[PDB]
Design a protein around this ligand. Structure first.
Ligand SMILES: NC(=O)c1ncn([C@@H]2O[C@H](COP(=O)(O)O)[C@@H](O)[C@H]2O)c1N
Ligand SMILES: NC(=O)c1ncn([C@@H]2O[C@H](COP(=O)(O)O)[C@@H](O)[C@H]2O)c1N
Lengths: 143, 143
């Protein structure tokens, strides 16, 4: 009763049926922060895939991103795009934004731990959103 | 419509009525990881204050901590104390574990952003748990 069990580390996301694949909330690169704030508070989601004009995932915008914005010493208002969070970090260029259903849990876990990120966006061959895998989903499996 | 509003940044946690102060789930320094895993999955909490034999807060143990454990290349099982997470980070010694009701939102926000942590444990004069303030609680206010 190695933790985690090797036979489950070698399995794919699809095999383990890990993630949420319906009713995903997401925003656009052109979305103002005030919109994200409203959805976080009222809809009760902790992070939102951020998609470009072509429907492709280019970032993920989280509650921590809003708090980071709040702590900036420079003058801001809520009418700035969610893309301003990109000044602080790039999940995209670090390869810690996306994953595929065929990837193993060992790959997924290592990718999360690499950048200390708490979720990944499951995408298709066009980088369009299929779903989300967060720490909660991985734990649910691990038990 | 500066964000965040200065008049709310200068206010205290107590003034803004931000945080959860009832029904807090928490564990001990002697608690095995398997116990934490069960509570995360079944009870639906994302982080647990970790208290010593004297009831004092010495760490906070989160879902990410379990995933970090899962990614360790060395052999582990679930019968290791939650204190093994201390090998990776010390929220305690970095001053990013605890806060007080009289502290301002500006102080709290800066402390969260300092270490990229997602919650703090509200403690009394003896460092005993009074409550929790997470990103969700700060956002709820900010609106
Ligand atoms: N953006 C979303 O819609 C979304 N983001 C996460 N989730 C799901 O919400 C649940 C809780 O996730 P978390 O514990 O990270 O808040 C998990 O099952 C996760 O896949 C969603 N439906
Ligand atoms: N350990 C706990 O019991 C606990 N930890 C967080 N909370 C509360 O749960 C709510 C959701 O927090 P989060 O979004 O970080 O999961 C917030 O209001 C927070 O104060 C708790 N009751």
């Amino acid at each position: 009763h190695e933790f985690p069990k090797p036979e489950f580390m070698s399995k794919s996301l699809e095999e383990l049926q890990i993630g949420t694949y319906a009713n995903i909330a997401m925003v656009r690169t052109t979305t103002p922060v005030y919109v994200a704030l409203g959805i976080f508070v009222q809809h009760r989601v902790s992070a939102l895939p951020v998609v470009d004009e072509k429907g492709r995932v280019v970032d993920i915008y989280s509650k921590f991103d809003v708090i980071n914005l709040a702590a900036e010493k420079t003058y801001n208002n809520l009418d700035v795009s969610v893309t301003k969070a990109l000044q602080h970090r790039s999940h995209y260029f670090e390869g810690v934004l996306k994953c595929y259903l065929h990837e193993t849990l060992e790959t997924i876990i290592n990718r999360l731990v690499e950048a200390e990120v708490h979720r990944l966006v499951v995408v298709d061959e066009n980088d369009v959103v299929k779903g989300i895998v967060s720490l909660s989903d991985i734990l649910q499996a691990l038990v």
